[PDB]
Structures are given as structure tokens and as C-alpha cells.
Ligand binder design. Structure first.
Ligand SMILES: *C(=O)[C@@H](NC(=O)c1c(-c2ccccc2)noc1C)[C@@H]1N[C@@H](C(=O)O)C(C)(C)S1
Length: 246
């Protein structure tokens, strides 16, 4: 599925070497100039399972539904042993996001009404809005979003155009804050998805907020293997340093 937009963008073709091994895309939005820059425009419109980057909105939804309160984000670990040790304990919003603990977000979804969620995705324009596929519709399932839409949503959230509480947004933003300096705030969320037993869907979405601007971005990777959140973030970090933002 494909996101249709005839928005203008600066071409970022010389980012191609960063995507060696991948069908990848990089979208930047410059809040002040109100301007997109894109490596690989066709790939920037292709919709893919957002995977773990969906946790961001799943969190905003749980807040809005008073499923999460500002001083109540803690969830009990039910004692199931996972392949990654960070998951094998109680979590709060911050840790759940830092370690990408799926069960935290699967509990959030389990307690939201599918129809409230459908309504949210309609409001926020979350890609194809297909949550019909399975229970974990955001994991290599029916729900798909493009790198450019990932940027539009972050921008819309941060410019308070989503009907979510400002403190809800602040909490969610804090949970994905990777670096906090005098001169910038650096926020992001990774995503990995497996198809055909290979890491084939890599996301890193976020933004850098400086003292006079905010540069929202999304990097997406598609490839035979090693297309993962970590690689996507590594690629994004290189690109962002080279534009001199991080
Ligand atoms: C979100 O994307 C989560 N991903 C998965 O559950 C997942 C994986 C997977 C691949 C490799 C290792 C662990 C899980 N394959 O398909 C899916 C749907 C979690 N977030 C990821 C991230 O990149 O931030 C992980 C790798 C931490 S798991």
C-alpha cells in the first residue's frame, strides 16, 4: 500500500551510500522552513508495518483512555521468560519504551476497544488504518505506514494537532528521549520486523529539537536481512550528524 501526496521536497539523493545493502528511505521535516527533504521518495511513500514505532501512539491512546495516568505507568511482569533479559521484569512507560517491551504495549492494546482505536487511527491518519489482520495488528500484520506519514504524525503530535493531552505527549516524549543537551533534545523510537525468518523491516523515527527549530525524521529499511531498528538508527545518526544536528 502507498501513501499519496504531491508535497514538495528537497531531494536527498546523496544519502544513497548510507543505505548500502537496503531499499531504504530517509525523510526529514524542517519545522521552521516547513520543508521536507527525502532520500528515495518512492520508498518514502511505501507503507510497511510500523512495528515497535506504533508503541508511541498506543501509549498516547492508553493515556487518553485514562488507562495510563501521569503517575501510574507501571505494569506487573507476569513471569514469562523472554529471549531478551530487559523484558523479564516490571516496567514503566520509560523502561518499556527504552527496552521495547512488547508485552507492555500488548496489555495496552488488550484493554482498549478496537473501535476507539479505529477511531483514533482515523483521526491521526495512521497509514492504511487496517487493524483487521490479527490481535497484534501492528507486528508484521495488517497495519502499515510510510516513512513520510511517520514524520507527519510526530510533527502533528509535537505541534499539538492531535487531540491528546499535552502532558500525555510530554510523558510519551520523555520515554523516547535519547539525549538531552543544552543545545538539543533528541527523541526516537526503533522498529524491527521479521518476515521469512529474516530481519526485513527496520524503522527509526523521531526528531531533534534545537533552540530554534525541530527536525523530524524517519528512516526506513527493507532488505534481505539486517534490516532492523538498530541499523536504521545507526544510519539516521550518521545522516543527522552530517546535517549537523546531533
Ligand atoms: C518492535 O519492533 C519489537 N519487534 C519485534 O517484536 C519483532 C522482531 C524481533 C526481531 C529481532 C529481535 C527481536 C524481535 N521481529 O518481528 C517483530 C514484529 C521490539 N522492538 C525492536 C526494535 O528494533 O526496537 C526489538 C528488536 C528491540 S524487539
Amino acid at each position: 500500500d502507498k501513501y499519496e501526496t504531491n508535497v514538495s521536497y528537497k531531494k536527498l539523493n546523496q544519502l544513497a551510500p548510507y543505505f548500502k545493502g537496503f531499499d531504504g528511505s530517509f525523510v526529514l521535516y524542517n519545522e521552521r522552513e516547513q520543508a521536507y527533504s527525502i532520500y528515495n521518495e518512492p520508498e518514502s511513500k511505501q507503507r510497511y508495518s510500523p512495528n515497535s514505532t506504533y508503541k508511541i501512539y498506543l501509549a498516547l491512546m492508553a493515556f487518553d483512555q485514562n488507562l495510563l495516568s501521569l503517575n501510574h505507568t507501571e505494569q506487573q511482569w507476569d513471569k514469562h521468560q523472554y529471549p531478551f533479559k530487559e523484558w523479564n521484569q516490571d516496567q514503566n512507560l520509560n523502561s518499556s519504551m527504552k527496552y521495547s517491551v512488547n508485552w507492555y504495549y500488548e496489555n495496552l492494546n488488550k484493554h482498549l476497544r478496537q473501535d476507539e482505536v479505529k477511531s483514533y487511527l482515523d483521526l491521526i491518519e495512521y497509514g492504511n488504518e487496517e487493524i483487521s489482520g490479527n490481535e497484534n495488528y501492528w507486528n508484521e500484520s495488517s497495519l502499515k505506514i510510510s516513512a513520510i506519514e511517520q514524520v507527519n504524525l510526530l510533527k502533528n503530535m509535537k505541534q499539538h494537532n492531535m487531540h491528546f493531552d499535552n502532558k500525555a505527549i510530554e510523558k510519551v516524549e520523555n520515554s523516547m528521549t535519547l539525549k538531552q543537551k543544552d543545545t538539543y533534545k533528541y527523541v526516537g523510537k526503533t522498529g524491527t520486523g521479521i518476515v521469512n525468518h529474516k530481519e526485513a523491516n527496520g524503522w527509526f523515527v523521531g526528531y531533534v529539537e534545537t533552540k530554534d527549530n525541530t527536525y523530524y525524521f524517519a528512516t526506513h529499511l527493507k532488505g534481505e536481512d539486517n534490516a532492523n531498528g538498530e541499523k536504521a538508527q545507526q544510519i539516521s545518526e550518521r545522516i543527522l550528524k552530517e546535517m549537523e544536528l546531533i
